[PDB]
């Protein structure tokens, strides 16, 4: 039927097109743009394939996907490939799959589903999110990769806070974990990650950064608007956790790019270089779009 919110689609497409028109000038290379074109193709294809999935099945898979992401996080520690001092990637030749993304989505689904029963015992308000998040954050710290750990923990914080459970301990853990880590016009196109962002910030200047931060602000706004437009509470929680994680990566790259936090492996979603991050962001956006399209169904 295609009863989606096409505004969010246009926002995602606009950020993606900005990322692509920037990469073609921010340290370009004939062979480095092909990888990202194929990543975009795979991402759109996967986000389309996932549209043949009802939300009932998707939340039926809330617990199996969480278990598979836990076991996959455990397995990457044994048979992974070290990159920047941590084994956090599965490399099978041309295939590059990082279990962090599966962990994020599985935990969001699992917590959303397990946290939609309004009455709870007076003890599990602390323990259930604890015992569902701690294995993930711990297996993320054994790599070690604390950027994804921060994203995961902050997502869990957003889910808990929107729900209405104890969240202050989660912020304590979050802040504690984060401590052990050219004009108005610009140039217009005239190897670390932040280079992808430093070239946009310098070749396009204040209008460029204002426009990009505005695109991200509108995306987070539309996500949180779709979140409170769902009758079921599990959907509200899932959408808000996703939007939280996205905004958190964005503000992390903000402080990384402007000399605040030490850099992490967290890219700017839909914008920074990275085929797996692009594909995973597209897949998560496909999930959020399909859970929004099925909001008035049983």
List interacting residues with Cl ion (CB under 5 A). Answer: 166, 168
Is the CB of 64 or the CB of 166 nearer to Cl ion?
Answer: 166
| Shortest Cβ 165–Cl ion spacing (Å) | 8
| Shortest Cβ 167–Cl ion spacing (Å) | 5
| CB 130, CB 245: distance < 8 Å | no
Is the CB of 240 or the CB of 267 nearer to Cl ion?
Answer: 240
| Shortest Cβ 162–Cl ion spacing (Å) | 13
CA distance 124 to 42: 40
Instruction: Find the length of the chain.
Output: 298
CA distance 57 to 84: 38
CA distance 193 to 86: 17
What lies within 8 Å, CB to CB, of 283 at 6+ separation is 43, 46, 47, 50, 101, 105
| Shortest Cβ 153–Cl ion spacing (Å) | 15
| Shortest Cβ 166–Cl ion spacing (Å) | 4
Is the CB of 166 or the CB of 262 nearer to Cl ion?
Answer: 166
CA distance 86 to 83: 6
Is the CB of 56 or the CB of 168 nearer to Cl ion?
Answer: 168
Is the CB of 109 or the CB of 115 nearer to Cl ion?
Answer: 115
CA distance 22 to 63: 39
């Amino acid at each position: 039927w295609l009863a989606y919110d096409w505004g969010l689609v246009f926002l995602v497409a606009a950020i993606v097109a900005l990322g692509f028109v920037n990469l073609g000038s921010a340290a370009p290379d004939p062979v480095l743009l092909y990888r990202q074109s194929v990543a975009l193709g795979l991402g759109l294809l996967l986000a389309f394939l996932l549209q043949f999935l009802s939300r009932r099945r998707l939340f039926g898979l809330a617990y199996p996907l969480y278990g598979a992401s836990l076991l996959l996080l455990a397995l990457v520690l044994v048979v992974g490939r070290e990159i920047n001092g941590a084994r956090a990637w599965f490399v099978l030749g041309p295939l590059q799959f990082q279990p962090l993304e599966l962990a994020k989505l599985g935990l969001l689904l699992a917590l959303a589903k397990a946290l939609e029963g309004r009455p709870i015992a007076r003890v599990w308000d602390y323990a259930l999110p604890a015992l569902l998040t701690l294995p993930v954050v711990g297996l993320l710290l054994l790599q070690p990769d604390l950027g994804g750990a921060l994203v995961v923990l902050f997502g869990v914080f957003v889910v808990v806070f929107v729900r209405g459970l104890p969240w202050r301990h989660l912020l304590v853990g979050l802040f504690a974990l984060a401590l052990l880590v050219i004009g108005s016009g610009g140039l217009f196109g005239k190897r670390h990650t932040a280079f992808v962002f430093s070239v946009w910030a310098e070749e396009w200047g204040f209008v460029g950064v204002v426009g990009l931060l505005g695109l991200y602000g509108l995306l987070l706004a539309r996500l949180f608007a779709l979140a409170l437009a769902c009758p079921r509470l599990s959907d509200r929680l899932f959408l808000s956790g996703f939007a939280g994680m996205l905004g958190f990566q964005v503000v992390v790259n903000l402080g990384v790019a402007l000399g605040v936090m030490p850099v992490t492996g967290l890219t700017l979603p839909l914008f920074s270089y990275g085929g797996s991050s692009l594909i995973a962001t597209l897949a998560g956006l496909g999930l959020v779009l399909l859970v929004h399209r099925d909001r008035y169904q049983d």
